[model samples]
Target chain A: DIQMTQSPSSLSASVGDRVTITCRASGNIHNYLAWYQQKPGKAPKLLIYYTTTLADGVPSRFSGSGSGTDYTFTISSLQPEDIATYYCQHFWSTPRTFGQGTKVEIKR
Target chain B: QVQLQESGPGLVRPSQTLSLTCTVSGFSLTGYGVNWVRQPPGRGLEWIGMIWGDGNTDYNSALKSRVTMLKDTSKNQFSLRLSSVTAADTAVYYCARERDYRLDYWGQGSLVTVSS
Candidate 1:
C-alpha cells in the first residue's frame, strides 16, 4: 500500500487570499491522484483528479499541479465556503489511500 | 442525475454480520462499479471494498478477511456484508461510484451503530 503524507496539518487564512495544500506519496504513482474537500458532517467533494485535471462542477479558482511523487492543491482566492478539511487520495493502486488532511480555517 | 441509496439496519449486535444494500438509479450496474466507504464518528474516511463492473471484487487489506461485496446486475444493485462486527465497526456507511479516478456520486450515508 502507498502511504500519503499531507503537509501543514492546518492553516488559517483570510478570505480572497491564496492558499495551497501539499501531499507527497511514498512512491511513484504515475499521476493517478485526486483532491477532495470535506466539510464536517458531510461527505467529501472531489476537486481535482489525474494530477491536475479539475473535476466537474468545481470552481475555476480551484487548481492542482505537480507530478511524480509530489502534488499540490491550490485555491487562487479562497472563499468563506472553502473553509474545510481537504484530503488527497491516490488511485495508482488498490486499497486507495488518503492523506491525513489539511484543515483550512478563516483567519480571525 | 445518478443517485445511490444505502439501506440496512441502523443497529447491529456484536459478533454479528452487518448487511447493506445499495440500489442505484439512472445508471447501469453492468457498466459501472460501486464501492463501499465508511467513516467512524470523528474519524477519517475508509474504503471498505469495491464491486467491479464485471462482478470482480477488490477489498481493503484491513477488512478483506471479513468483507464481502456482491453485485446483482439484473437489479442494478449491490450489497455488502461484514462479519464479526464490533463497536469499532459503527459508522456512517456510504455507497459511491468512481469516475475518472474520483468518487463522483455518493449516497447520503446511513448511520450504523453497533451495540447490544
Candidate 2:
C-alpha cells in the first residue's frame, strides 16, 4: 500500500494569497496522482488528476505538479471559497491511498 | 451529465453486515468501474473497494477480508457489502465512477451509522 504524507496539516491565508500544499508518496507512484477539495458537510470534488490536468470546470488558478514520490498542489490566488480541506491521492496501485489532508482557512 | 446515487439503511447494529446500492445514470455498467469510498466524520476519504467494468474487483488490503462488491449490468448499478461491522465502520459512504483510473463522478453519499 502506498502512503501519502501531506504537509502543513493546516494553514490560514488571506484572500488572493498563493496557497500551496505538498504530498510525498511512500514510493515512486509515477504521475498517477490526483487532488481533491472537500467542504464541510459535502463530498469531495476532484480538482486535478494525472498530476497536472485540471478536472472539468476547475478554475485555472488551481494547478498540480511533481513526479515520482513528490507532488504539489497550488492555488494561484486563493479565493474565499477555497477555504476547505485538500487531499492528494495516488493511483499507481491497489489500496489507493490518500494524504492526511490539509485544512485551508481564510485569515480573519 | 453522469450521476450516481447510493441508498441503504441509515443505521446498522454491530456484528451485522452493511449493504449499499449505487444506481447510476448516463453510462453503462460495462463502460466504467464503480468504486466505494467512505469518510469518518471530519476525516479524510478512504477507498473501500471497486468493481471494474470487466467484472473484476479490488479492495483496500485493510478491508479485503470483509469487503465484497457486486455489479448488475442490467440495472446499471453496483453494490457493496461489508461484514462484521463495528462502530468504527460508521461513516458517509459514497459511490463513484472511475474514468481512466481516476474517480471522475461521485454520488451524494449516504451516512451509515454502525451502532446498537
Candidate 3:
C-alpha cells in the first residue's frame, strides 16, 4: 500500500486568494490519484480525478495536476465555501490510502 | 445522477457486530462497484473495503479479517459487516461508487457510534 503525505497540515488564506496544496506518495501510483474537499460536518466531495480532470459540478478554479510520486491541487481563487480540509487519495492498489489532509481556513 | 444511501443503527455496543446497508439509485449494481469508507471523529478517511462489479471483494489489509462486504444485485443494494467492533470503530461510514480510479459518487455518511 502506498502512503500519501500531504503538506502544511493546515493553512490560513483570505478569500479571493490563491492557494496550492500538495500530496506526495511514498511510491509510484502512476497518476491514479484524486482530490476531495470536505467541509466541516459534511461528507468529502470529489474535486479532481486522474490527476487533473475536474469532477462534475466542481468549480474550474480548483485544478489538479501531477504524476509519479507528487501531485498538487490548486485553488485559483479561494472562496468562503472553500474553507475545509482537503484530502488526496491513491487508487493504484488494493487497500488504497489517503493523505493526512490539509485544512484551509479564512485568514480573517 | 447516481446516488448512494446508507442506513443502520446509530449505535452499537462494543464486542458486537456492526451491520449497515447501502441502497443505490440510477445505476445497476452489476454494472458498478461500491466501496465502504469510514472516518472516526476528527480523523482522516479510511478505505474499509469494496465489492466489485464482478462480484468479487477486496479489503483494507488492516481490516480484512473483520470486514465483510456483500452485494444484492437483485435488490440494488450492498452491505457491510464489521465484527468485534470497539470504540475505535465508531465513525461516519459512507458508501461510494467506485469509477475508473476514483469514487465518483458518495452517500451522505451515516454516523455510527460505538458505546457501552
What DockQ does each listed candidate score? Answer: 0.69, 0.75, 0.85
Question: Candidate 2 has what TM-score?
Answer: 0.97
lDDT of 1 by residue, B10-113 (tens): 99998999999998888878778797889898777777878887889999988998999998778878899988999999999989898657788888788899
The lowest-lDDT stretch of 10 consecutive residues in candidate 1 chain B is B99-108
iRMS values in order, in angstroms? 1.1, 1.0, 0.8
C-alpha RMSD between model 1 and the true structure: 1.4
TM-score head-to-head 1 vs 2, winner = 2
Scored by CA lDDT, what does every candidate get?
Answer: 0.87, 0.90, 0.90
Model 3 lDDT per residue over A29-95, tens place: 9888899999998788999988889998987999988889999999988889899999989899876
For each candidate, what TM-score against the reference? 0.94, 0.97, 0.97
lDDT of 2 by residue, A1-108 (tens): 788899788998999999889999999888999899988888789999989999999999999899899999999888888889998888898777889999999887
Worst 10 residues of 2 chain B by lDDT: B40-49
Candidate 3 lDDT score at position A13 = 96
Model 3 CAPRI rating? high
**lDDT by residue (tens digit), candidate 3, B1-116:** 77899999999999999999999988888878898999998888888989986779999988998999998887878999999999999999999998888998899889999999
Tens-digit lDDT string for candidate 2 (B37-71): 99988777888989998889998988999989998
